Inverse folding.
């Protein structure tokens, strides 16, 4: 059980082919018409985990 | 064609931009903008020997 | 355009990013342009907002 | 040096202004580690594929 | 002038980054001096 939860929380540092692994940096740097593409990559990657 | 190449997410520099500054608040749930770092939390002094 | 804004766009007319439609245009060197000079029309640049 | 990216529409920032990995509106509140600028000259034609 | 070869032991390691870390085992991928050279 410890291994499963340890690996789940370490998946948040991956990028899944995006600009950065933090939502705030993406939102504060890119415009909404374009930043929605970058966020879509994190959502699909984190939903799989 | 002037190219204004730059990097990000490194040691902070003087070149930031035209924004103001405020005082400090502690032990309160407050958003922070410590030179790009955006988020919320509670700020407390400790003994982390940097 | 739905994306990007220009000097006239951000100060006179901004197009929404979620825009569904067509834009049609053509030269008006004789329709809206006077052969002796066109100055009746005006454009705004000092909205400050 | 504290910069000011409000130099838009002063002499001639027209024709091409597209950015990469950043939006033009968000320059005013982004602090950079370094700023790198070059001002080479080209033939001003189809060779603009840089 | 006069040359020789000797073992480098386990020297040639530094602090790759200025990010503070405590009680962790980080795995870096930087340029180093290979051990026992
Ligand atoms: C280093 O170089 C010397 C001479 O080239 C050689 O004798 C030696 O085996 C090499 N390796 C070590 C670990 O000394």
């Amino acid at each position: 059980n410890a291994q499963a939860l340890n690996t789940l929380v370490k998946q948040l540092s991956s990028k899944f082919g995006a600009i950065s692994s933090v939502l705030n940096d993406i939102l504060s740097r890119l415009d909404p018409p374009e930043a929605e593409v970058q966020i879509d990559r994190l959502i699909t990657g984190r939903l799989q985990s | 064609v002037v190219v204004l190449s730059f990097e990000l997410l490194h040691a902070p520099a003087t070149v930031c931009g035209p924004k103001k500054s405020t005082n400090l608040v502690k032990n309160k749930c407050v958003n922070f903008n410590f030179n790009g770092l955006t988020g919320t939390g509670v700020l407390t002094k400790s003994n982390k020997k940097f | 355009a739905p994306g990007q804004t220009g000097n006239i766009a951000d100060y006179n007319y901004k197009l929404p990013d979620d825009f569904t439609g067509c834009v049609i245009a053509w030269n008006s060197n004789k329709l809206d342009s006077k052969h002796s000079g066109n100055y009746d029309y005006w454009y705004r640049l000092f909205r400050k907002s | 040096c504290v910069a000011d990216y409000s130099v838009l529409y002063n002499f001639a920032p027209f024709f091409a202004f597209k950015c990469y990995g950043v939006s033009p509106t968000k320059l005013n509140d982004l602090c950079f580690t370094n700023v790198y600028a070059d001002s080479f000259v080209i033939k001003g034609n189809e060779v603009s594929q840089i | 002038t006069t040359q020789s070869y000797t073992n480098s032991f386990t020297r040639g390691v530094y602090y790759p980054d200025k990010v503070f870390r405590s009680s962790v085992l980080h795995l870096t991928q930087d340029l180093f001096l290979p051990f026992f050279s």
Summary: The helical segments of chain C are 7-11. Residues 33 and 46 of chain C are 24 Å apart (CA to CA).
